[PDB]
Symmetry: C2
Subunit: 125 residues, 2 copies
């Protein structure tokens, strides 16, 4: 009866992800790859800017390869639990994933390890 | 040595979003979304989620709103043009550290139509403390 929106494809792996913010936290640069395991991986540089707290700001849309990427941060669970969610959409495939990283994971500017993978969903555009 | 890549998909039944609809007021300054969240492990939770704006509440980000065990936010994107507008919810169960992102096109929900069949989504782990 229900319709699963999960696509029958390999999980997309977000590779070598890191966040580096400048001294004033007015710019944060996220760098990562998107490896679908079905095509050449795409390297992404994704810059978010704000007058203050760029680490908390919503970003995009940015186009990287076949992907349209946005992001948003949530402090809904308090500051120890802040986390950023990306929306990574391949319009041509009508597929989307939402990689979500806590501030704890990224705050030192070190690469997140292990790389994390996510099951894409169909977006019936 | 390098740890193997890690799937964030939890080994749980997909959460089904039931009877989803959106009703907006005449001026589109407030939209009320109603739906259930059925995890298949407990009675489904009936939710009411209101998004307000000075204009275009159907395009506005909303939340956080608490509905039972869930914390819900939403955002809208017209990145692909207005015919392809779509809303994405973030539905988190903090206690379980699980999150899903149901996403509905503007076509699906226009005029208060109920989305059918009900759509299900695989939750991801969110490594909160």
């Amino acid at each position: 009866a229900d319709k699963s929106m999960m696509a029958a494809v390999p999980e997309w792996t977000i590779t070598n992800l890191k966040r580096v913010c400048n001294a004033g936290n007015t710019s944060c640069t996220w760098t990562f790859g998107v490896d679908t395991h079905l095509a050449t991986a795409t390297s992404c540089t994704y810059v978010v800017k704000a007058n203050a707290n760029a680490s908390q700001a919503s970003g995009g849309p940015v186009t990287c390869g076949p992907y349209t990427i946005t992001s948003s941060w949530s402090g809904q669970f308090g500051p120890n639990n802040g986390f950023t969610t990306f929306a990574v959409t391949d319009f041509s495939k009508k597929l989307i994933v939402w990689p979500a990283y806590t501030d704890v994971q990224v705050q030192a500017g070190k690469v997140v390890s292990p790389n994390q993978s996510y099951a894409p969903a169909n977006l019936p555009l």
